[PDB]
Design a protein around this motif. Structure first.
Motif, PDB file in Angstrom:
ATOM      1  N   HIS A  67       1.697   3.773   2.200  1.00  0.00           N
ATOM      2  CA  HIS A  67       1.282   4.360   3.439  1.00  0.00           C
ATOM      3  C   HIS A  67       2.934   4.005   3.206  1.00  0.00           C
ATOM      4  O   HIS A  67       3.811   3.559   3.080  1.00  0.00           O
ATOM      5  N   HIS A  93      -7.462  -1.237   6.324  1.00  0.00           N
ATOM      6  CA  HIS A  93      -6.969  -1.194   6.409  1.00  0.00           C
ATOM      7  C   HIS A  93      -6.455   0.378   5.216  1.00  0.00           C
ATOM      8  O   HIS A  93      -6.556   1.160   6.198  1.00  0.00           O
ATOM      9  N   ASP A 119       5.557   3.546   5.704  1.00  0.00           N
ATOM     10  CA  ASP A 119       5.672   3.116   6.599  1.00  0.00           C
ATOM     11  C   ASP A 119       5.974   1.636   5.410  1.00  0.00           C
ATOM     12  O   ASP A 119       7.077   0.655   5.190  1.00  0.00           O
ATOM     13  N   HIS A 171       0.597  -1.494   0.066  1.00  0.00           N
ATOM     14  CA  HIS A 171      -0.175   0.149   0.396  1.00  0.00           C
ATOM     15  C   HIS A 171       0.698   1.061   0.345  1.00  0.00           C
ATOM     16  O   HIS A 171       1.996   0.978   0.262  1.00  0.00           O
ATOM     17  N   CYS A 180      -0.860  -4.454   6.104  1.00  0.00           N
ATOM     18  CA  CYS A 180      -1.367  -4.058   7.451  1.00  0.00           C
ATOM     19  C   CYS A 180      -2.818  -4.371   7.401  1.00  0.00           C
ATOM     20  O   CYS A 180      -3.548  -4.004   8.919  1.00  0.00           O
TER      21      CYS A 180
HETATM   22 CO   LIG Z   1      -0.408   1.319   6.759  1.00  0.00          CO
END
Ligand SMILES: [Co+2]
Length: 214
Positions: free
Chosen positions: A75, A136, A77, A73, A155
């Motif tokens: 994000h 998520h 992280d 994804h 996640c």
């Molecule tokens: Co995430």
């Protein structure tokens, strides 16, 4: 089983089987796939500094280059090492939505090559990517290794130790349960599930995530 840390406890790899390892950095997980054509990562790391260290550690250990990474994804992280991947000529695979979101948020763009179901082969290692729906995040995918029945939940999937859903700012908490159900319907026989963060488990982590959603 065999666990290998760098200098500092900052990066760890733990062997799941002959050719599949879990990478963990300070805690976030991904996979290292040791294939006949090179190393493939499922997710890189938090930022460029840790992504460079991760790649260097695995290249030295396995004596082959990292050729490909699957981004689960958009994000930080997860997208955070994209600069490093691009400048080294490492193919950064993603869905089009993940790439859209990366660009929107000021990151360099992964390839946007993954569809709802994509089947990839790296040497003899088979990899299936699956977009199960929103959870998520809008864009989260899972990764399946059909030769091993190993699922990388990212996640979307919470570890046993997780007692709540964590960051829900970008989440879709109704759709998340349907998305997990879609994973359970597609993959009815699971040997190991790798959560985004925390200890490796089995199908129980999916059921745990369902309970956290109630
Ligand atoms: Co995430």
């Amino acid at each position: 089983k065999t666990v290998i840390k760098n200098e500092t406890g900052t990066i760890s790899i733990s062997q799941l089987n002959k050719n599949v390892w879990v990478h963990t950095e300070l805690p976030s997980n991904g996979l290292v796939l040791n294939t006949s054509k090179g190393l493939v990562l499922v997710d890189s790391s938090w930022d460029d500094k840790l992504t460079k260290e991760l790649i260097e550690m695995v290249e030295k250990k396995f004596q082959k280059r990292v050729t490909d990474v699957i981004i689960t994804h958009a994000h930080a992280d997860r997208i955070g090492g994209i600069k490093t991947l691009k400048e080294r000529g490492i193919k950064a695979h993603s869905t089009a939505l993940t790439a859209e979101l990366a660009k929107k948020n000021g990151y360099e763009e992964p390839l946007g090559d993954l569809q709802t179901v994509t089947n990839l082969k790296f040497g003899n290692m088979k990899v299936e990517t699956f977009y199960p729906g929103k959870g998520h995040t809008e864009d989260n995918i899972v990764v399946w290794l059909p030769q091993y029945n190993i699922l990388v939940g990212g996640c979307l999937v919470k570890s046993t130790s997780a007692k709540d859903l964590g960051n829900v700012a970008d989440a879709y908490v109704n759709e998340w349960s349907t998305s997990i159900e879609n994973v359970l319907k597609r993959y009815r026989n699971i040997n190991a599930v790798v959560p985004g963060h925390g200890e490796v488990g089995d199908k129980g982590l999916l059921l745990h995530t369902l309970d956290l959603l109630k």
